[PDB]
Amino acid sequence: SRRWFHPNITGVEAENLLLTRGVDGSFLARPSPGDFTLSVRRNGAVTHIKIQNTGDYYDLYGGEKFATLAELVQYYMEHHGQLKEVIELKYPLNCADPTSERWFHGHLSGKEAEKLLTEKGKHGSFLVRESQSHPGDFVLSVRTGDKSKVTHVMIRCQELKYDVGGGERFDSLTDLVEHYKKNPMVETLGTVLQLKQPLNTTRINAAEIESRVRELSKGFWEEFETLQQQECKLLYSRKEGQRQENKNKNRYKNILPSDHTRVVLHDGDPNEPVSDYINANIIMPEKKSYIATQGCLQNTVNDFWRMVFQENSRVIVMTTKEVERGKSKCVKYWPDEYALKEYGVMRVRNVKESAAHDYTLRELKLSKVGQGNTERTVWQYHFRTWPDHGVPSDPGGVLDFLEEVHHKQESIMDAGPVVVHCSAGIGRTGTFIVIDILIDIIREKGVDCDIDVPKTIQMVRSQRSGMVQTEAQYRFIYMAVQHYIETL
Numbered sequence: 001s002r003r004w005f006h007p008n009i010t011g012v013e014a015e016n017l018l019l020t021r022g023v024d025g026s027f028l029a030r031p032s033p034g035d036f037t038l039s040v041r042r043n044g045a046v047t048h049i050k051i052q053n054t055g056d057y058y059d060l061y062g063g064e065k066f067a068t069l070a071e072l073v074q075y076y077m078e079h080h081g082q083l084k085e086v087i088e089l090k091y092p093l094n095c096a097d098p099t100s101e102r103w104f105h106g107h108l109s110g111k112e113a114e115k116l117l118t119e120k121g122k123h124g125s126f127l128v129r130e131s132q133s134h135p136g137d138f139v140l141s142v143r144t145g146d147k148s149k150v151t152h153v154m155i156r157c158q159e160l161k162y163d164v165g166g167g168e169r170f171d172s173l174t175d176l177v178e179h180y181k182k183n184p185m186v187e188t189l190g191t192v193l194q195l196k197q198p199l200n201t202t203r204i205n206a207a208e209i210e211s212r213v214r215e216l217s218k219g220f221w222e223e224f225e226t227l228q229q230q231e232c233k234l235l236y237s238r239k240e241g242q243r244q245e246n247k248n249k250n251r252y253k254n255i256l257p258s259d260h261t262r263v264v265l266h267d268g269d270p271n272e273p274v275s276d277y278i279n280a281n282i283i284m285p286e287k288k289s290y291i292a293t294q295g296c297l298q299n300t301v302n303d304f305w306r307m308v309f310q311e312n313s314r315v316i317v318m319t320t321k322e323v324e325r326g327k328s329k330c331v332k333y334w335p336d337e338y339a340l341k342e343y344g345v346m347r348v349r350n351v352k353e354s355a356a357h358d359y360t361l362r363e364l365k366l367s368k369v370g371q372g373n374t375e376r377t378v379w380q381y382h383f384r385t386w387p388d389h390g391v392p393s394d395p396g397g398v399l400d401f402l403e404e405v406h407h408k409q410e411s412i413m414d415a416g417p418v419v420v421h422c423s424a425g426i427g428r429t430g431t432f433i434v435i436d437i438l439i440d441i442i443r444e445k446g447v448d449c450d451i452d453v454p455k456t457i458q459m460v461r462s463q464r465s466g467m468v469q470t471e472a473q474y475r476f477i478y479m480a481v482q483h484y485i486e487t488l
Contacts, residue, residue, distance in 0.1 A: 005095060007100050011039075024088075026041045026091045028093045037050060040088075054389040067256075106129065117150050124143070127199045137157050139153065181195040200452070203452035209482045239259055265307060281293075292421070294424055295425070296330055302343045305343045313416045316420075319420065330422075334350055334380060338352075347369050349365040350362060359384055362379075391473055396483065402439065
């Protein structure tokens with residue numbers, strides 16, 4: 001569903017492709033960084049529209065803000081009249097470059113393919129690689145078994161099309177793979193060459209993180225975009241956030257919670273027709289859980305405290321300033337130090353504030369009005385030194401921060417999910433949560449455990465779309481993990 005994204009194309013090439021192989025309404029998206037471009041053909045000419053992402057959201061110039069490029073494209077394909085200089089997205093110009101596909105390995109020998117498929121592969125595991133002997137051709141290496149074997153199928157490239165020696169000829173490796181996934185090749189002796197899953201190429205041992213980081217630093221961008229390519233594979237709806245009564249409860253109208261994991265507020269005032277909504281999702285790893293949410297709006301402060309109370313959350317992680325670059329990223333939802341405030345039916349006292357170098361700790365006491373026995377302490381950790389754009393140069397501050405947060409959470413019996421928020425609740429929020437999840441595994445298991453960064457991110461994204469926004473954050477996650485392991 002994401003063929004419209006061309007990772008390795010230039011501006012001129014994009015214009016060439018749209019004018020010779022496309023029509024009016026044809027479009028494609030491409031990388032510039034953290035910048036992208038939406039190239040669209042209209043009235044026999046090509047226009048380019050900048051998309052910026054500094055870490056919080058995808059910002060379409062002359063358009064709106066989105067959690068993913070997929071939701072951006074989907075939005076405007078379904079909403080004619082709103083992309084303006086009027087620019088229509090009608091026909092995706094599909095990419096035939098296989099580099100971002102999980103199963104593509106490029107230059108790889110037959111023996112090395114068998115090696116990788118042996119150590120990590122299972123039945124139906126497969127990959128596609130370049131021919132060793134015949135330049136331009138390719139090889140489909142698939143593992144089948146319980147004994148088990150590996151089968152190498154030759155893929156010839158004749159006149160810009162691909163085939164396995166007979167039958168249909170395909171325009172791309174992707175088309176060929178999808179075809180023989182759906183219609184499995186059968187060997188003479190009857191073996192079904194099922195293509196069940198691509199060979200995992202990202203799971204590594206924790207002690208080898210440093211070697212992998214060096215390899216990726218020589219890597220990060222191609223691994224990240226391979227992950228980005230899978231964003232459409234997640235099944236989710238965002239209908240509740242689209243309801244009329246819920247529209248102004250979203251900081252960014254198109255950045256919405258996934259319905260299946262959203263925090264549903266009960267005990268609402270029956271005089272409010274819709275009182276069960278907040279832009280927030282439960283994130284469960286796959287013992288500690290999280291709530292990924294946006295920075296409060298003036299009209300959602302009361303809902304925020306309803307959520308914290310209901311979910312029995314005892315720790316809040318704030319990863320933004322109230323104001324950044326002159327714009328409000330989060331309203332002050334906590335009282336001044338020593339002060340007491342009522343937020344709807346919720347009462348909060350700011351007991352004490354404590355200043356550290358990278359963050360401020362606020363010890364808060366939350367209770368329901370009229371209910372003395374409901375009081376509990378909520379620890380708000382407010383990270384203050386995250387740069388306006390991009391990521392910190394060094395993960396030490398964040399690691400120390402999360403380490404403290406972790407121990408506070410672990411010290412409270414039966415504490416609910418840790419609340420994490422930034423501006424839109426997907427970029428910095430996603431980055432903090434993924435690091436915390438990965439560190440959690442290492443803290444318990446040491447260097448003797450497998451970690452898979454993009455798989456973990458995908459798992460989190462299945463619960464809230466857009467978690468982890470940029471390549472800079474992706475790389476920062478690796479650097480943080482690498483740093484934590486070394487300082488054990």
